Amino acid sequence: YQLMCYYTSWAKDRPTEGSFKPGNIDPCLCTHLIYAFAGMKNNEITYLSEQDLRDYEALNGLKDRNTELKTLLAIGGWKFGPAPFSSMVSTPQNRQTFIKSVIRFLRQYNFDGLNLDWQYPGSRGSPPKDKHLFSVLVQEMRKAFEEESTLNHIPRLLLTSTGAGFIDVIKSGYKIPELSQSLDYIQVMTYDLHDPKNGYTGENSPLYKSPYDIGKSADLNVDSIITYWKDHGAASEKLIVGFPAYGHTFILSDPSKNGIGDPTVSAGPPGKYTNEQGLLAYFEICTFLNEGATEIFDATQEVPYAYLGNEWVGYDNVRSFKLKAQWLKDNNLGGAVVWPLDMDDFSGSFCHQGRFPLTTTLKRDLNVHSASCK
């Protein structure tokens, strides 16, 4: 099984005890480290800031301790949006400029591959034709990686892509059989399933649906999403399940109605370290629990939630990671991807469950072993 772990460039910029640097990632913990994010300039991949080059060096230097460790560079993300990718895939000339810049960039900065994270082809303004053009880009990029490998007599660069977790978004943007042929891995975005706009508490990444989830809500769970990708032609061993190291928060309409599916006023206030309304890192949730929040493990969805007064959080813990890891193995999936590793308890001081408790649960249960680490 694979165990991929994201490192986000902004994690080192969080205040005081929340700051986490890439050089402090345990090199034996994951099979792949993914750096979020690279940007684009004139149809060429590039760094977002010159300081990212120092992060690339620290991240890639971990391969000197774990010689089997692989590193990927992620381009895109929610904030970047669809427009740069739409322009880049629009012509063969722009795709060639991009593919050539990727090979050159990955090799010069010692990355083992690229993670495409276009959010999303075919939606958010991206036209219907981008479903076909994204598949063309992926085929052409895989072919160029094979040709570079043969020309230089070195292992081929890896090619991965994120995959939407929302059915309508999957339908309008992904030619699943073609993408599965050319990609090494598909990182399925099995998280942010809390449906913030419906006015009820919802889980971030439940394994199974709530019996109260009706219609489109019934597909907002790991089991339903992965089943959809498999039913539509994705290779099971190429599927990498998204494991969030954070939760989503809500302000309860009534503090006495504190279960899943209960009425909400708004997303919860930003955390001291992550500073994003409606989100708390796993390390911040540990503080919330230590400061008196009531912890409930919902067996119907196989995920926890916690509440304190009118503040409610739906998240993942050691137990939910354990149960999803067994389900992953039972379903012959390719592995897991921790999103983001920097929101797990990287120091061991917030949760007192040792360093990286969520990720360590996956390393142990997915039998991740490197010959270089024994």
Numbering used by the authors: 1 to 374
Give verbatim excerpts from the published study on this entry:
Individual crystals were harvested from the BAL fluid of mev/mev mice (carrying a defective protein tyrosine phosphatase Ptpn6 gene) developing crystalline pneumonia and C57BL/6J-Tg(CAG-Gal10)Bla mice (transgenically overexpressing Gal10 from the ubiquitous CAG promotor, manuscript in preparation), sensitized and challenged with the allergen house dust mite (HDM). We had hypothesized that the crystals obtained from the BAL fluid of C57BL/6J-Tg(CAG-Gal10)Bla mice were CLCs containing Gal10. However, crystallographic characterization of these crystals revealed that they are Ym2 crystals. Native in vivo isolated Ym1 crystals and recombinant Ym1 crystals as well as native in vivo isolated Ym2 crystals and recombinant Ym2 crystals were crystallographically equivalent, sharing the same monoclinic space group (P21) and unit-cell parameters. Moreover, X-ray crystallographic studies showed that a native in vivo isolated Ym1 crystal and a native in vivo isolated Ym2 crystal are structurally similar to each other, which is not so surprisingly as Ym1 (Chil3) and Ym2 (Chil4) are two closely related proteins sharing 95% nucleotide sequence identity and 91% amino acid sequence identity. (C–E) Structural superposition of the X-ray structures determined from a native in vivo grown Ym1 crystal isolated from the BAL fluid of mev/mev mice (C+E) (yellow), a native in vivo grown Ym2 crystal isolated from the BAL fluid of a C57BL/6J-Tg(CAG-Gal10)Bla mouse (D+E) (blue) and a recombinant Ym1 (C) and Ym2 (D) crystal (grey). The low root-mean-square deviations (RMSDs) establish structural similarity. (F, G) Crystal packing of ex vivo Ym1 (F) and Ym2 (G) crystals revealing their crystallographic equivalence. Here we show by ex vivo X-ray crystallography that Ym2 also crystallizes in vivo and that the phase transition of soluble Ym1/Ym2 to crystalline pseudo-CLC states leads to profound immunostimulatory effects on innate and adaptive type 2 immunity. Given these similarities, we assume that Ym2 crystals most likely will stimulate innate and adaptive immunity and act as a type 2 adjuvant, similar to Ym1 crystals, although we did not formally demonstrate this experimentally.
Although mice do not encode Gal10 in their genome, they do form pseudo-CLCs, made from the chitinase-like proteins Ym1 and/or Ym2, encoded by Chil3 and Chil4 and made by myeloid and epithelial cells respectively. Ym1 (encoded by the Chil3 gene) and Ym2 (encoded by the Chil4 gene) are CLPs belonging to the glycoside hydrolase family 18 (GH18) and are unique to mice, with no known human orthologues. However, Ym1 is mainly expressed by macrophages, neutrophils and a subset of circulating pro-repair monocytes, while Ym2 is produced by lung epithelial cells, which could have discrete context dependent benefits. Ym1 and Ym2 are among the most strongly induced proteins in the airways of mice after allergen exposure and both proteins readily form pseudo-CLCs in vivo.
